[PDB]
């Protein structure tokens, strides 16, 4: 729920964890996380442009190897 909206929006994408979130240049508002082997470009970790918009990147986030162990992102 935003100020500027005043309404309870649901996140369209179906995620497990939101290890990081926040505003980036050109996108406005963003969430890291996942949905549900050692290639850098596989990543298993969807960015999400907030307000139920496009995944926006699935290309150069952290490897799926590390996807099991990581608890926090900065």
């Amino acid at each position: 729920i935003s100020s500027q909206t005043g309404k309870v929006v649901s996140v369209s994408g179906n995620f497990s964890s939101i290890q990081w979130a926040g505003e980036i240049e050109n996108l406005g508002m963003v969430l890291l996380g996942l949905k549900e082997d050692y290639a850098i470009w596989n990543t298993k970790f969807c960015v999400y442009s907030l307000e139920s918009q496009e995944v926006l990147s699935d290309i150069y986030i952290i490897p799926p190897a590390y996807s099991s162990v990581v608890t926090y992102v900065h």
Binding site: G22, E23, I24, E25
Partner: peptide
């Protein structure tokens, strides 16, 4: 005694602000 004082804080993107574009001018 405090050689610095913070009198505001502003919305910044990640890292921080892109150089050259921001401006500051003191009148009196």
């Amino acid at each position: 005694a405090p050689r610095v004082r913070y009198l505001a804080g502003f919305c910044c993107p990640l890292g921080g602000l892109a150089a050259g574009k921001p401006r500051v001018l003191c009148h009196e």
